[PDB]
Design a protein around this ligand. Structure first.
Ligand SMILES: [Ar]
Ligand SMILES: [Cl-]
Ligand SMILES: [Cl-]
Length: 162
């Protein structure tokens, strides 16, 4: 397992524009197009992203391309965030994949607000971090996914994804 297979499992793959768990237009592997309620707006942002008139539909390769850019962007975001980087550099490889998953889902911003959890992770207090992580709107809204990521930070293994 790795970061790509992990997010491919949590996000799925859809080749036509769809609405995500929050009702926002998305496509591919969890690639958010816009928070706007306008489908047109979404179609415009997709065309701009792909570089052609897609008419709301993309191929597998194109979805995979957006995905690669999105993961890379997520890592880069972490390394650029002063609150995130130190945590991230302190973790082992498996747990770093968990941190990337969260950033991919909720943004650098969103994750950087889990102050207390971040500090517990930095201290390697796994069980405590796992309990604090679950006290969040994130866990109550997407509990199955949150549980998989949480177990990942807790154990340092990929058992939740096997
Ligand atoms: Ar992080
Ligand atoms: Cl883009
Ligand atoms: Cl879920």
């Amino acid at each position: 397992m790795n970061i790509f297979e992990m997010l491919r499992i949590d996000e799925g793959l859809r080749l036509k524009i769809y609405k995500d768990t929050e009702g926002y237009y998305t496509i591919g592997i969890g690639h958010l197009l816009t928070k706007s309620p306008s489908l047109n707006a979404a179609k415009s942002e997709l065309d701009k992203a792909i570089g052609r008139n897609t008419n709301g539909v993309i191929t597998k390769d194109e979805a995979e391309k957006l995905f690669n850019q999105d993961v890379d962007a997520a890592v880069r975001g972490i390394l650029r965030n002063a609150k995130l980087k130190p945590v991230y550099d302190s973790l082992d490889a498996v747990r770093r994949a968990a941190a990337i998953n969260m950033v991919f889902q909720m943004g650098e911003t969103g994750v950087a607000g889990f102050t207390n959890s971040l500090r517990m992770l930095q201290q390697k207090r796994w069980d405590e971090a796992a309990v604090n992580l679950a006290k969040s709107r994130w866990y109550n809204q997407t509990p199955n996914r949150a549980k998989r990521v949480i177990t990942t930070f807790r154990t340092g293994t990929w058992d939740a994804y096997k």
